[PDB]
Design an enzyme around this catalytic site. Sequence first.
Site, mmCIF file in Angstrom:
data_model
loop_
_atom_site.group_PDB
_atom_site.id
_atom_site.type_symbol
_atom_site.label_atom_id
_atom_site.label_comp_id
_atom_site.label_asym_id
_atom_site.label_seq_id
_atom_site.Cartn_x
_atom_site.Cartn_y
_atom_site.Cartn_z
ATOM 1 N N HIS A 44 -3.688 -4.230 3.973
ATOM 2 C CA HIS A 44 -4.570 -3.474 4.871
ATOM 3 C C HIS A 44 -4.018 -3.245 6.275
ATOM 4 O O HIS A 44 -4.386 -2.281 6.936
ATOM 5 C CB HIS A 44 -5.947 -4.146 4.983
ATOM 6 C CG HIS A 44 -6.899 -3.429 5.888
ATOM 7 N ND1 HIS A 44 -7.518 -2.247 5.534
ATOM 8 C CD2 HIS A 44 -7.341 -3.726 7.134
ATOM 9 C CE1 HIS A 44 -8.301 -1.850 6.521
ATOM 10 N NE2 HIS A 44 -8.212 -2.729 7.504
ATOM 11 N N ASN A 83 -10.749 -0.436 0.697
ATOM 12 C CA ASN A 83 -11.818 0.281 1.389
ATOM 13 C C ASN A 83 -11.957 1.766 1.043
ATOM 14 O O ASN A 83 -13.068 2.291 1.026
ATOM 15 C CB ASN A 83 -11.664 0.108 2.904
ATOM 16 C CG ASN A 83 -10.216 -0.113 3.330
ATOM 17 O OD1 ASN A 83 -9.315 0.638 2.953
ATOM 18 N ND2 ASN A 83 -9.993 -1.143 4.130
ATOM 19 N N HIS A 84 -10.838 2.440 0.778
ATOM 20 C CA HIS A 84 -10.867 3.865 0.425
ATOM 21 C C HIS A 84 -10.928 4.097 -1.081
ATOM 22 O O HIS A 84 -10.674 5.203 -1.547
ATOM 23 C CB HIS A 84 -9.631 4.596 0.961
ATOM 24 C CG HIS A 84 -9.572 4.681 2.451
ATOM 25 N ND1 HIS A 84 -9.130 3.641 3.239
ATOM 26 C CD2 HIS A 84 -9.912 5.680 3.300
ATOM 27 C CE1 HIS A 84 -9.200 3.996 4.510
ATOM 28 N NE2 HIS A 84 -9.672 5.229 4.574
ATOM 29 N N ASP A 112 0.768 -1.250 0.000
ATOM 30 C CA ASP A 112 0.000 0.000 0.000
ATOM 31 C C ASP A 112 0.800 1.303 0.000
ATOM 32 O O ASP A 112 1.403 1.672 1.010
ATOM 33 C CB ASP A 112 -0.965 0.004 1.184
ATOM 34 C CG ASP A 112 -0.861 -1.252 2.025
ATOM 35 O OD1 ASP A 112 0.262 -1.796 2.176
ATOM 36 O OD2 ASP A 112 -1.912 -1.692 2.544
ATOM 37 N N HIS A 124 -7.142 -8.033 0.960
ATOM 38 C CA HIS A 124 -7.091 -6.809 1.745
ATOM 39 C C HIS A 124 -8.057 -6.984 2.920
ATOM 40 O O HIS A 124 -9.259 -6.780 2.768
ATOM 41 C CB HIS A 124 -7.528 -5.655 0.847
ATOM 42 C CG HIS A 124 -7.239 -4.303 1.408
ATOM 43 N ND1 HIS A 124 -8.229 -3.467 1.875
ATOM 44 C CD2 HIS A 124 -6.074 -3.634 1.568
ATOM 45 C CE1 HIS A 124 -7.685 -2.340 2.299
ATOM 46 N NE2 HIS A 124 -6.380 -2.416 2.123
ATOM 47 N N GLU A 154 -4.477 2.286 -2.625
ATOM 48 C CA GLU A 154 -5.676 2.839 -2.005
ATOM 49 C C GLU A 154 -5.415 3.972 -1.015
ATOM 50 O O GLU A 154 -6.348 4.507 -0.422
ATOM 51 C CB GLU A 154 -6.470 1.735 -1.314
ATOM 52 C CG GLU A 154 -5.771 1.129 -0.130
ATOM 53 C CD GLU A 154 -6.683 1.049 1.072
ATOM 54 O OE1 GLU A 154 -7.789 0.480 0.939
ATOM 55 O OE2 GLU A 154 -6.298 1.557 2.147
ATOM 56 N N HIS A 169 -0.766 -2.665 7.086
ATOM 57 C CA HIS A 169 0.319 -1.682 7.082
ATOM 58 C C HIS A 169 1.612 -2.078 7.800
ATOM 59 O O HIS A 169 2.463 -1.235 8.065
ATOM 60 C CB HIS A 169 -0.202 -0.356 7.652
ATOM 61 C CG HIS A 169 -1.326 0.229 6.858
ATOM 62 N ND1 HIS A 169 -2.157 1.210 7.352
ATOM 63 C CD2 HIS A 169 -1.761 -0.033 5.602
ATOM 64 C CE1 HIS A 169 -3.055 1.526 6.436
ATOM 65 N NE2 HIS A 169 -2.837 0.785 5.365
HETATM 66 CO CO LIG Z 1 -0.729 -2.970 4.045
HETATM 67 CO CO LIG Z 2 -7.263 -0.339 3.972
#
Ligand SMILES: [Co+2]
Ligand SMILES: [Co+2]
Lengths: 252, 252, 252, 252
Positions: free
Chosen positions: D170, D65-66, D8, D145, D37, D172
């Site tokens: 998701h 999600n975003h 991400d 995710h 995202e 991180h």
């Molecule tokens: Co991630």
């Molecule tokens: Co996310």
Amino acid sequence: MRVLFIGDVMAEPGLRAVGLHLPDIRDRYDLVIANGENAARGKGLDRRSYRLLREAGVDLVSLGNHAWDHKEVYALLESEPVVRPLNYPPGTPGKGFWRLEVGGESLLFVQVMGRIFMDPLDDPFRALDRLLEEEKADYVLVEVHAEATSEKMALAHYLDGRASAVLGTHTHVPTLDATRLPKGTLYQTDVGMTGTYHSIIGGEVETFLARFLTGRPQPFRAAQGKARFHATELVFEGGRPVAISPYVWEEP
Amino acid sequence: MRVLFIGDVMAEPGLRAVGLHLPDIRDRYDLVIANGENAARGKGLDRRSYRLLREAGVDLVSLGNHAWDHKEVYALLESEPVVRPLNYPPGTPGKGFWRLEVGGESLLFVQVMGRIFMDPLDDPFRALDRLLEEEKADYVLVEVHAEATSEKMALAHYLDGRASAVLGTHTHVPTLDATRLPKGTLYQTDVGMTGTYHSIIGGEVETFLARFLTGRPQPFRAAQGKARFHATELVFEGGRPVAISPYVWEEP
Amino acid sequence: MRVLFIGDVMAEPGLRAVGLHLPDIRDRYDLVIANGENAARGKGLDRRSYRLLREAGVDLVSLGNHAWDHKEVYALLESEPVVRPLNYPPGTPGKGFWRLEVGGESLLFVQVMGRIFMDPLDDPFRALDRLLEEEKADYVLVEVHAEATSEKMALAHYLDGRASAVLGTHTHVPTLDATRLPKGTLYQTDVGMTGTYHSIIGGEVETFLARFLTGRPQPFRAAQGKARFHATELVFEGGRPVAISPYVWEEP
Amino acid sequence: MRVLFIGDVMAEPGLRAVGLHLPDIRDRYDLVIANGENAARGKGLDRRSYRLLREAGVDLVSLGNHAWDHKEVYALLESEPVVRPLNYPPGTPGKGFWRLEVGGESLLFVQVMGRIFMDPLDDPFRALDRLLEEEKADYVLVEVHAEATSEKMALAHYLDGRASAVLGTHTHVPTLDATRLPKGTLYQTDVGMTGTYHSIIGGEVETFLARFLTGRPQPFRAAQGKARFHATELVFEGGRPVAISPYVWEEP
Ligand SMILES: [Co+2]
Ligand SMILES: [Co+2]
Ligand SMILES: [Co+2]
Ligand SMILES: [Co+2]
Ligand SMILES: [Co+2]
Ligand SMILES: [Co+2]
Ligand SMILES: [Co+2]
Ligand SMILES: [Co+2]
Ligand SMILES: [Co+2]
Ligand SMILES: [Co+2]
Ligand SMILES: [Co+2]
Ligand SMILES: [Co+2]
Ligand SMILES: [Co+2]
């Protein structure tokens, strides 16, 4: 059609309340449907509690999230007028809907489970769209077993003009909002629980109290005591929703 | 005393409902409290929302989760009769309780917010204990802004005999369970919302249905239309809770 | 002082893995702490699992959400080096922390539980504030048992310059982010699980698969297989955190 | 086939790391895929964000999600090689899969979203079964995710022997658990995020710390600083997944 809808049957007092009072009023209705998600001493449905419901005059029993607590439920699901949420995934035991026939008229009953603040399941809205396309009937009653009032209201407006009535359950407290939506569908957020209100949603007060206070697991304990019979009446005449009226009976 | 508690004031219809009708029954009560957490276009409270409610005859406004949507609330929390959930952590703007005074008698009003299906806050049960240990009044009214019925009921029982009355909010649907608990404390799971019911919990039907159908964000739009005034009347006399009664008024 | 921290001990393979490998490297450390939340067959801790851990060379055992899974824990909580999450409410059995003494040098161990996607417990941030205020020691080790990585990082930053190191658990998966925070505090998002990885989170693959596929209840069944010992080495010296090194040992 | 999957891309730093470094190692891989995202200031994706990613050597960008935070995303979803979760409801903008091709070999990339601790979406498992029947390719890369490690693993095992590799996102935070499943499918719980790690999951430390301490809303603000470029290298040969190796690059 004159339909009686009975609010969540909660553990032994609930089953007792139905067994004792339904017989005295069954004659007033063409069909009687009841949620028996907690009928088996508070958790689920078993052969015994099913029998007492049927013998009391109940024609169809719906479940909910607790639909699987007891084994016996699987026999009831394949051969008896018992339904589970429509929107479980494919391959799920039992049926998500039932067709009732009375006086030459038909009533399609359907229970669906909300997803907000609950377990992930299939989309209730589209599951309903598909069902209503394949199963036609004189009347359609949809029970929405959910936690969120917004989800229950969303489903009802979405069903306006298609369902004759949308009744919510799960919350255990009867709501003072029985009405008919713009396109004619009858609606109530929650029918209420049928059991002893000398408790916290069926369970013993101190048990639930201990949960909130200690933050530690406390095994469920069904409360005992005088029960309240909670249900909602639906009047379907000429293929159109006519009236909806909450019903209450206090055990002597 | 004789207290009127008004269910969540939802956006412009809710505000109109209070302004149009409260003046007419204002003289029947000693104190009028109202939840104004959605007063400002459905989100939080601002100066205009606040003045309107006051002009209608409201003596005290409580909030909840949307309390911080508008920076104008700070001045209000700072010098006006407006309260926020007691169970926010230390260093939180405003007060979590308000002791009203009328004709020589006192009424301690407190609002607590539930934690189930909501944000992590301090323990409302023990939050109330600390407050009630140091704060005394002739009567005590606790509003429980929560999602779960079990949490509201747990809080009511826990306050039984201590609080004069315990009323629930946040759900937006009036419940028909106004009762008197064992030790005399009056209770109602949810007072219901004040605003147009031609919506989904005050939100435009089209908007909410989109959120549910798509799973994609949809900016909140406040529904517009005829409103319903939802409140609950309380009668406290001789240092004891006398009566609790759900009140409704349909906007012509 | 040279500290070894051992990642969640998962059911029988986990207990075995420690009983086997820890004695061979115990020399390398001055003190050893272990999370035994899942010691007793994956659920909680009991007399046997606890004993096996001490005999293996563990000086202190921490729990978490599964702490109350076996009532044998209570006795262990009031007489043995076993601690439960610090932020439980007042009156909760056991201690929320424990002091370890190794050659004059003292090590204060603290376990805190996150609230995001978990239960409503006391504020962990201010909980540590009160503790670290009334409890001093040459070194401070805080374990953060939480689900959200944001909550762990926030707790870590909030403790930066106060704790010698902060280690996270509950994820069951070792993270590669061991580092030094701005003010010196050592940190790693998740130590990892100690048990068989031929499973999903320590549970049989099939059981868990069935849960996600059917959306129906599936009792937990501890997976069996080769274990993979997971821990993290902490080197505190001269009153200052010097090093942090994740450690792995696969069972032959 | 050599595929590079970048974790991400978080705001400015993340976007910078990719542009500065990817052009250096781009020749070392056949296909480069990235989750973006959070590319546009940590909130979704936009034209500028997307252009920089493509100009940096990325062949395909995934969302999450975003994905809907920016209106420009819809246009990108229509023409550009950008994907959103397959497991959104029908009628959802864009695709949830993409067929890439490099000199004779084909790669089907898919992104699904978990549901635990997240929003109600379609069943990702059965969504994958359906897609995998109509879309075939030499190799298959599935990005999960999600929040729950148990869900990511359950999905991985469900795809074992069917998908060439399953990478999660998701969270991180890179996990040290890259591995090969019983039937050959490569797997890793979380690739980790690409952006400055001197923050709480990409956000300003102070901002997120403020949210956790006050319990009141604080607008999102992307942290700035030296970035860490996180990715995972995948090697697919002879029609089977050969190697999986985490990849990191500290910004000078
Ligand atoms: Co991630
Ligand atoms: Co996310
Ligand atoms: Co409509
Ligand atoms: Co239920
Ligand atoms: Co109910
Ligand atoms: Co009667
Ligand atoms: Co009147
Ligand atoms: Co009581
Ligand atoms: Co609210
Ligand atoms: Co070794
Ligand atoms: Co810091
Ligand atoms: Co845990
Ligand atoms: Co397998």
